[PDB]
Subunit: 224 residues, 6 copies
């Protein structure tokens, strides 16, 4: 029950479902989520994935209480992942949003990076993909302040493709997924795969640097 | 008559002129267009190029009926190319727009990538330059859906620098070209050349990957 | 008196102060400014730097009258620099703005690149960072025309994070700086340092090309 | 008969067999060779490929008589290709050797790049992979002179891993292939695939530049 | 006693000392070794580090019996590390050798990569640094065969700078370290740091790809 | 007389001629040398350049007595430069050798990097091109020790293509130049230009980092 899954017309929707913990990613939820992404890749009945959260929060981040060296786990996918951001997407949860190919946001969406507030460095690509998707200045402002970015500003900045009234969110994400499903899937997958290969070639160096920064930070922190 | 050309105050305007075929790029029009770009480069009376289409469409893409391994042909230019997008710019036509240094759009402009609809992969840089100029999420949404991007959204996303009423389009493009012509041309050409060299260094890897993806797609398609 | 400095709650504000020369960067002001940035880095009482100009101009650029091979001098910093753009930021002054981590603009702000007007090529990163922060098309339009970009367009394009009424400018910059100061400084500095390392890895090739273009331009200019 | 093929203990040996035309790559031989590489990839009974030529020449290059825009065709492989160089490997034939993962040479081997002699630019990666595998100075010396590199110098320069007496060549290549076959194939293929991905990330930009240089050369040549 | 350490004339020598386990890197030895490298960096009495092993083996690799996700731990150093390779350097031990700035080898030295034999992928940079330091062909031959590279071939290939009689090894390494100590240390450290920054910029993308390949391999292996 | 020049059969030979100062590069000699390279590029009677020194030294480096911020000046050339290394090539002189496309060495040749001995960091590409042309380990050994590399080791390492008896040096360089002159010059220049563009794309980031390291070193040195 901590992860819901639904397959409908070649679209798999994955719903983070720990609303009482604001969909925080416990170890168990991590295992289920990343496992579900991998299963979607290998499932020949799935063309598109939608990820979302049970209201009122998209994902508050990692369950820090429960836990640190937090390795990246988002798998190589050849199928598009649409993030239907229904609420706050914070830190590790902002990183889940940044992994998506396409984002659509409820008016209730908001985005924040609290890594520096809580004294952790990112290891799931925030430091590469946030400046890539909202611009250097805004990424730096977000990360260093830990302030919320509204849905409207996220749209202005290019973080999301659309903002809809809250109750239309999953419909809006399904409509985009249906447009994709209706196109030539050999071409969709080949073109997405290529886009990922073009992007990876540009992000790889950064992701390594991010990893090494996090490691150095953790190690120096063990001067205590 | 399939390509019009006009030189006025050191600005060469090239107009795709097959309006009845929505300015689709036949083999002949390709030869004329790319040939004209090359001639503009070597013509010492030209500082700036404007490309546009006969109404109501900018360019509907390659003439697919007539035709496939479609090699890139846009030449090395040291002079700025302004695209005056007067209508729909689709697929290969969106790639012509993405090659321009600067875009200005009529309110009647719209942009779409139908490669995945029609079962072709891009070979004129769409997969590199679309995410570069409208952002990763929007590029992926466009490519995988094949949906139109409006003139206003194109402006919001950074695809175009300006949107004007339809009848002001060529005037708006000429005004920008005149501002350029009025500056130090040695500096204009040296600075543009450098901008192109800086950009090429970042896009080259991607363009190769795009080419290889297209090739692999074509070859696997010859499992039929 | 040509550079003012003030330290307050772990924020150092540096004010270019030659308003009668529109804060043009003379040799002396360059020495003071870059020297002050370096001192801020080594000063353990400073977490954040704000740069601004005495009204009504942010910085009109280098003092060209007084002067050319103008080497880059902005030092390696591990602390964030917020640019509080109070007025026109032109050419070398636009480059000072482009060096900042975060920009906030008065409604009175405007941005222009007159390098090509005045027959100089950039050597302080404009040709790398302008397309990075406002997009390729707009950067090329700005550089080749030398036209002003308004505060509102700068906000739309992602050049600045915010635009405020003129009298609120320094308050708005101090509020952002205070949010940063209130977070874990070990994390702030480590994350910023990493962001800079990720970015430098992407800009280095471009900056070298910019330098070489400027050099070739200067050398060919000595065919006179 | 223009391409021989043999499968033995999970090793596929492909022999260019037009010895009377010094194994020149006609259109037909190209189709057969590249087709055979692709079939080896998909053949689950093959772990390793050896390529070689019927004596006394490895490959004299493309059949130029018969033919120009010569697109690259070496496919994505996840299996190692050992080149057993039995004689001269010239121009397009040197490029076939440079595509191999591992080279072993007969004492009778020699290598030359005659592209500049014959007025053609490379399109099968010579200009990237020759400096990569023999060093910048030697690559430039080879390409600009068109002089032969001996087997012994090829060994000194790192172009080949070993040089054997002529009659031991295929035995030496089979021994290496047998060592590979005897290791964990899941690991062999995963590690090779990774090596290729690491290398491609470094060569892609170069290969694009090579392609564009060749194109510009061909186009300017059509000023005649 | 599992790691020996000695400081003499501003040179710290670290000796792996589990000769009965062929200096295999247990968890404890890993902690001691990487900890010692970090301490050398911060120790103001040390200019140069020499790493070596108790005879007859340099390092047989990780203690696999004892153990898998084996994260990289070699720290950022601004001081040169000379590897005095006294015997076999295998797999993880070859990676320790590949991390060194400079290698000198006993005649008794040999090098092998058994990752593919033992069904593991590298995570300490072998897949980036082996082709960098011995050339693509030889790296691929080594990795896929798991065959030993002799001291003499290692010298021919550029893996080591020198090969000495066994009893002269540490003297030869101390002589090089003494030459370094005798030069301007501010310059030595600044130049080394720069060399590392130049190299890291080229290896980072590869190291990320290596990490991701290893992860994917481990995850697929958990289909069992 | 400080620079000799000779044109013979489309080969321009430039001889550094301050043998009493071991061909040290004074300001005047720098101006003449770099000026001569530029003139060779524009001279339509020249296909190839040979650089050499009056015996017994190739180039001892910059005239340090006479002088520091030493900017790079080697121009963009589309014609090959062969370095005929007749004696010691030290520091700035090793950098002149590293700029050449092809090197041939007298038995009397030797190479050294004394930057760290004399407390200077390189600004003419040593820190990029030395590891590129002799391998990382040997470059680091050379730079940090300041020890001489013999002609024979230079040949083993790939720094030079050939080593000849002293009296045959210029004949050997002329023979290579004659082979180049005898090939299709349109192809020679196009292929060389491409090789330079492929290489520049890989070295640019490094050269920027080198420049920034040198600058930081000079600036910190002004803590005195
Ligand atoms: C350390 As994390 C998963 O919040 O980037
Ligand atoms: C194959 As096309 C010219 O539409 O990118
Ligand atoms: C030459 As400048 C400091 O205006 O980029
Ligand atoms: C044009 As060719 C196949 O000899 O590189
Ligand atoms: C997994 As390992 C430390 O042998 O590269
Ligand atoms: C500072 As220098 C010309 O010896 O690299
Ligand atoms: Ca299913
Ligand atoms: Ca943007
Ligand atoms: Ca004309
Ligand atoms: Ca203080
Ligand atoms: Ca079979
Ligand atoms: Ca080598
Ligand atoms: Ca001590
Ligand atoms: Ca002449």
């Amino acid at each position: 029950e901590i992860l819901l899954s639904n397959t409908e017309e070649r679209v798999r929707t994955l719903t983070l479902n720990r609303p009482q913990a604001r969909n925080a990613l416990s170890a168990a939820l991590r295992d289920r989520f990343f496992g579900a992404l991998a299963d979607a890749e290998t499932d020949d009945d799935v063309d598109v994935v939608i990820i979302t959260g049970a209201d009122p929060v998209f994902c508050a981040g990692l369950d820090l209480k429960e836990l640190p060296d937090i390795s990246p786990r988002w798998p190589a996918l050849t199928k598009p992942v649409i993030g239907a951001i229904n609420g706050a997407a914070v830190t590790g949860g902002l990183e889940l949003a940044l992994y998506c190919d396409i984002l659509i946001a409820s008016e209730n969406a908001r985005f924040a990076d609290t890594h520096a507030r809580v004294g952790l460095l990112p290891t799931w690509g925030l430091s590469v993909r946030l400046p890539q998707k909202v611009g250097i200045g805004l990424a730096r402002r977000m990360s260093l302040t830990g302030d919320y970015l509204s849905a409207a500003d996220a749209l202005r900045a290019g973080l999301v493709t659309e903002v809809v009234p809250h109750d239309q969110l999953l419909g809006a994400a399904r409509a985009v997924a249906a447009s994709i499903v209706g196109n030539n899937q050999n071409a969709v997958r080949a073109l997405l795969t290529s886009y990922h290969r073009i992007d990876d070639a540009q992000t790889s160096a950064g992701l390594w640097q991010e990893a090494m920064a996090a490691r150095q930070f953790r190690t120096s922190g063990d001067d205590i």
